[PDB]
Write a protein that binds this ligand. Structure first.
Ligand SMILES: Cc1nc(C)c(C[n+]2csc(CCOP(=O)(O)OP(=O)([O-])O)c2C)c(N)n1
Ligand SMILES: Cc1nc(C)c(C[n+]2csc(CCOP(=O)(O)OP(=O)([O-])O)c2C)c(N)n1
Ligand SMILES: [Ca+2]
Ligand SMILES: [Ca+2]
Lengths: 678, 678
């Protein structure tokens, strides 16, 4: 029941957001000024503990419309999370804790948003991840997970294909604890939504399978909002959209203009707004004691009490259910099982040639039983990507009769970007979740918005990217990656592995699965590739290593994936004409650059021409080679062996070019490419 | 009204598709078999001339589910286009005219499809362009324009959010002539649709503003199919989606299973299919003469008359309306206006400091009314990308009162990937359309699926990618691009222009617009750059030029955009303590690479260290520079000066690295990065 202090709390939130922006002289005031009534009614009612932003059973909230940050920064400060008035007084300034869009890193900021469509897609991950933790561990008497996921989204989030892909998926999956409040404010940048966004959101979300509720006066009606969120929590097998109509800039002298969406309210306009709300036009960053006190009784102190009950419950759970207790206790400590690597496969030059894609399949068979925290799937290619383990159970709603919520094989359907960002949500949940998803390497580029965010945030999701090259063959150039790895090798903090054989696939799985902050893309072959006399998990784990050495080489050939194989074979050719080639396999530039310089330079030295072999774009190879053999044009639809021969990637074709590079450079001295001047 | 021959043509299409697949022993056979009735019936009521595939008013077909290409190659052959049973007999083989997914580059193939969600979004562009052409030239008694745009799509297209993003804008724009038939076959790759897709498409489509029609028996109801396409043609105010039901792999012994989705059928199964359809199990690629006669009759000879009357009409029109008849014939010969390039702004160092964002807005204003084919706009950032010319009318339905279809400024909404395939589709329409779309450089990455196909097909779309670097300032790392230009520089066939000043922007536009086959991306600034002494349209047009030159330079500083004036100041500091820099401005890697090597090696020779300055990834710059100063980590939220400074990009900070590159190399003989060994 909302009293006058509930109306004083909401004026302090709107004005503190307004002051935060206008101090920085940069920012978005409109959506924070309009959603403040909702942020109050929701947080007031959210089971959280601000002294411990990591409790696993915390109600999670994602502000999908990340430009409204001053609303999250104000909510976080007033409800006793770690953020201060000086932090807010340094909004959007260099080296502050308050950047212009929310970053995962910070406390009580659950994922990082600002790309539109990303937050609501992340909250689907979080609710899936919760459905599973609860099905796995919750025993009768010990309901350890049951948190809700509350999301704030705007018109930009609904316009973007990804929220639509995600919402189709949340709907099918019956994700009943996922409440989305849509700030239906009839404005975006260009102007009004009637100019470009005018479809029936409600009829669209109902088609998906979502329950849609409505709040006619979201600017003033705390009462309404409270009853909607309340009925929304009765939605046990439907996600809910609450279409809450508000006014952009509410209170501002230009409320409803498109002008209050992304620039600070002009001085006087903040003064009239302070007056109208009962605050002083000449004072800033003012918070009444009454507000601090209110959220202390309403949120801080009961959340702590809830956290503390959850802890006693988890210890009797541990006493009762000693091994489930154990397993969850570890996932929460964030440890991978003691010595899990001992179940990763190892091969010899003696074992059969198998496509790196089938070798990926075999790892996933040996680690699913070892890691209850590994949930993953495919975006409609389970057969093609060799991405499921034989003894799996799909993540599905119990009524489907074709899986249940404890399943760990997710079927994402043809939805790459959404797969990408749901993966970040599962990851951002906690309890050591290790998410992965399979697709064809070429279409990971459809997911680029979400993949950059796994890198910026530092979320360890794994992309199992199959069909990595022209070896795809007859599907032709719409489906042969040329630029994909180059691109992702310019992205900071992502590991773009490309395993060449058995042992290079297990090292690629062990560093990805051991990663705590870098995402990963493992590019895998369609075609059969042999096992190398020289590969080993141990060496490939370094990201680049000498596969075959010669004493005193004429050339060093660095190759990745299928080309390593071709290179060894080109090296027998050159050997026969008395050229001594050293062959270096570089499975990952990331991991490799993480090595100490002395190690790297022992692989790639001074005074030796270095020529690289990779069937994709030569442009990222300048940091390791002197000359590069690669494909800088699009592919061709033919039987794959003919496509490689057509492009020249043959033992003698590589060899011929190795010869031409030796000749080109005879008599010069050559600095290693790794060496830099500053 | 359909007859025994119409039931024999449908059989002939079914079995030719099956034979084109089994000969290749690579292919997806089921959607060809399933959809053959629908194909026969739609292609029969199409105004098209198989003899002149470029006829501007031909009803346009787009197979959005590209993987069903065996049905398309069967249709194109049988109706009299240039494709013989021989080209059909080398489907999917290295070098044939019959690749494994359609490519724009073929007669009767309108767009390259294969990546899901791409063809339907393309067809929305083709309908927007039709609507503009007709509203611009159609005068009474002279309907020069009135064609339908027909699209076939399947479940996978529907799950790709680009196709939702596009069906929303189409719903908005009321594109009544776009009719889309959907293969409700109830199979995709991972088995059944319900496994992960059971939303109500129809209800979703009505919410966009589409008319939905249903055909219960797609397998054999020729009359009902024909009914739904007549019915659909009536609604001028609604795009129409016909939901048709088919058995995937109809007629096969394994019809309805996901097995017939992507694999050639078993021989015993192809013999029983042929027998079942009255054809000889022991003969391949049979086209009964009555089918040939039938299509000659019902499609080719009509089509040739519609085309001919159309030309008589167009010459009366050029008698009747001189200017408009000459402009349309000029656009139809793909020639831009004579000396259109003269209206482009030139500047000098005495001119003012301007962000190249404003300068771009100005070129758009000065040439709009010279180039009637330029139609374009932003993705809800019209104010940020300054993407307007002000005497503009928006492209809208007349009934909006906001504009009408003669408008040439489109407001895409926050829909980047659909803007990507709609500009592709507008371009693919003809009449010399010059689309351009705008968004932030950073989020062109949402549109990468579309941007690669612009390049792979060679549709000349211009992206006006504003806000190129850490100069975006306070919005911080989620908006500041780090890897983007390196990604697009690794993709074959796209101009990535990053112009430094007024003249370099005119240069970008001149080149972009005269391009008939290569897309373009112009990365514009936020902050104000000044007018470089030494730039010119002419030099800037070569891709890279020497801005300042010295007799016997100690260093060459290569730079792009904002970094070229910095590098000119770094050179001013270096000279002061006598190190001579030649400063080379490199606004487009593509165009520069297209130059005669004698010109290129004159810009970057041997025996000088070359260091490159750009506030973005260093990974691309191996092909021009000996050392690169750049940013290989995400950005920062702060005021942009403070952020450039933080990163080190100050005159002195640059002078300093040049000094260190000179000392590092002093004494080695150097080679231009341009000289390649093979
Ligand atoms: C993917 C994406 N694209 C774009 C291009 C933007 C730029 N952007 C920021 S706010 C916004 C639209 C804001 O509209 P809204 O969601 O309705 O927010 P409101 O109601 O104005 O607060 C745009 C286009 C973005 N942040 N992310
Ligand atoms: C963007 C994208 N992603 C993917 C991953 C694919 C791979 N692909 C090809 S066909 C298809 C399934 C298509 O199913 P459908 O459209 O229902 O086809 P149908 O009815 O069985 O002929 C998939 C996943 C693709 N071509 N494009
Ligand atoms: Ca809005
Ligand atoms: Ca299907």
């Amino acid at each position: 029941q909302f009293t006058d202090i509930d109306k004083l709390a909401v004026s302090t939130i709107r004005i503190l957001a307004v002051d935060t922006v206008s101090k920085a002289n940069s920012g978005h005031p409109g959506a924070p000024l309009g959603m403040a009534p909702a942020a109050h009614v929701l947080w007031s009612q959210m089971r959280m503990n601000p002294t411990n932003p990591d409790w696993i059973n915390r109600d999670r909230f994602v502000l999908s419309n990340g430009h409204a940050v001053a609303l999250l920064y104000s909510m976080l400060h007033l409800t006793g999370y770690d953020l201060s008035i000086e932090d807010l007084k340094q909004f959007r300034q260099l080296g502050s804790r308050t950047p212009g869009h929310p970053e995962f890193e910070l406390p009580g900021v659950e994922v990082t948003t600002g790309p539109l469509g990303q937050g609501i897609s992340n909250a689907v991950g979080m609710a899936m991840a919760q459905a599973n933790l609860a099905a796995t561990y919750n025993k009768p008497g010990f309901t350890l997970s049951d948190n809700y996921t509350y999301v704030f989204l705007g018109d930009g989030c609904l316009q973007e294909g990804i929220s639509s892909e995600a919402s189709s998926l949340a709907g099918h999956l019956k994700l009943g604890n996922l409440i989305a409040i849509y700030d239906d404010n009839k404005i975006t940048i260009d102007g009004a939504t009637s100019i470009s966004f005018d479809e029936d959101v409600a009829k669209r979300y109902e088609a998906y399978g979502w329950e849609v509720l409505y709040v006619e006066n979201g600017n003033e009606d705390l009462a309404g909002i409270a009853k909607a969120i309340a009925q929304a929590k009765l939605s046990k097998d439907k996600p809910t959209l609450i279409k809450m109509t508000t006014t952009i800039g509410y209170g501002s002298l230009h409320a409803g203009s498109h002008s209050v969406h992304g620039a600070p309210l002009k001085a006087d306009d903040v003064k009239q707004l302070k007056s109208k709300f009962g605050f002083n036009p000449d004072k800033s960053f003012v918070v009444p004691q009454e507000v601090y006190d209110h959220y202390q009784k309403t949120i801080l102190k009961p959340g702590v009490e809830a956290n503390n009950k959850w802890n006693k419950l988890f210890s009797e759970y541990q006493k009762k259910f000693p091994e489930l207790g154990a397993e969850l206790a570890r996932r929460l400590s964030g440890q991978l099982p003691a010595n899990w690597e001992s179940k990763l496969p190892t091969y010899t030059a003696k074992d059969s040639a198998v496509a790196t894609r089938k070798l990926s399949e075999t790892v996933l068979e040996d680690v699913y039983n070892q890691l209850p925290e590994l949930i993953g799937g495919s975006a409609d290619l389970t057969p093609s990507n060799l991405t499921r383990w034989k003894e799996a159970l799909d993540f599905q709603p119990p009524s489907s009769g074709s899986g249940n919520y404890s399943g760990r094989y997710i079927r994402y359907g043809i939805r790459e970007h959404a797969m990408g960002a749901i993966m970040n949500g599962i990851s951002a949940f906690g309890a050591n979740y290790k998410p992965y998803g399979g697709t064809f390497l070429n279409f990971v580029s459809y997911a680029a918005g979400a993949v950059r965010l796994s890198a910026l945030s530092g979320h360890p999701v794994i992309w199992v990217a199959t069909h990595d090259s022209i070896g795809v063959g007859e599907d032709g150039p719409t489906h042969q990656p040329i630029e994909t790895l180059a691109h992702f090798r310019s992205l900071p903090n992502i590991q773009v592995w490309r395993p060449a054989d058995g042992n290079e696939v297990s090292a690629a799985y062990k560093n990805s699965l051991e990663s705590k902050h870098t995402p990963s893309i493992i590019a895998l072959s369609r075609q059969n590739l042999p096992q190398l006399e020289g590969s080993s998990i141990e060496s490939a784990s370094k990201g680049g290593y000498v596969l075959q050495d010669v004493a005193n080489p004429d050339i060093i050939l660095v190759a990745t994936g299928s080309e390593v194989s071709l290179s060894v074979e080109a090296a027998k050719t050159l050997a026969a004409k008395n050229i001594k080639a050293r062959v270096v396999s570089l499975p990952d530039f990331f991991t490799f650059d993480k090595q100490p310089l002395e190690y790297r330079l022992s692989v790639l030295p001074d005074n030796v021409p270095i020529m690289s072999v990779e069937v994709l774009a030569t442009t990222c190879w300048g940091k390791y080679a002197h000359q590069s053999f690669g494909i800088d044009r699009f592919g061709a639809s033919g039987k794959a062996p003919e496509v490689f021969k057509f492009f020249g990637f043959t033992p003698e074709g590589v060899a011929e070019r190795a010869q031409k590079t030796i000749a080109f450079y005879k008599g010069d001295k050559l600095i290693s490419p790794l060496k830099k001047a500053f």
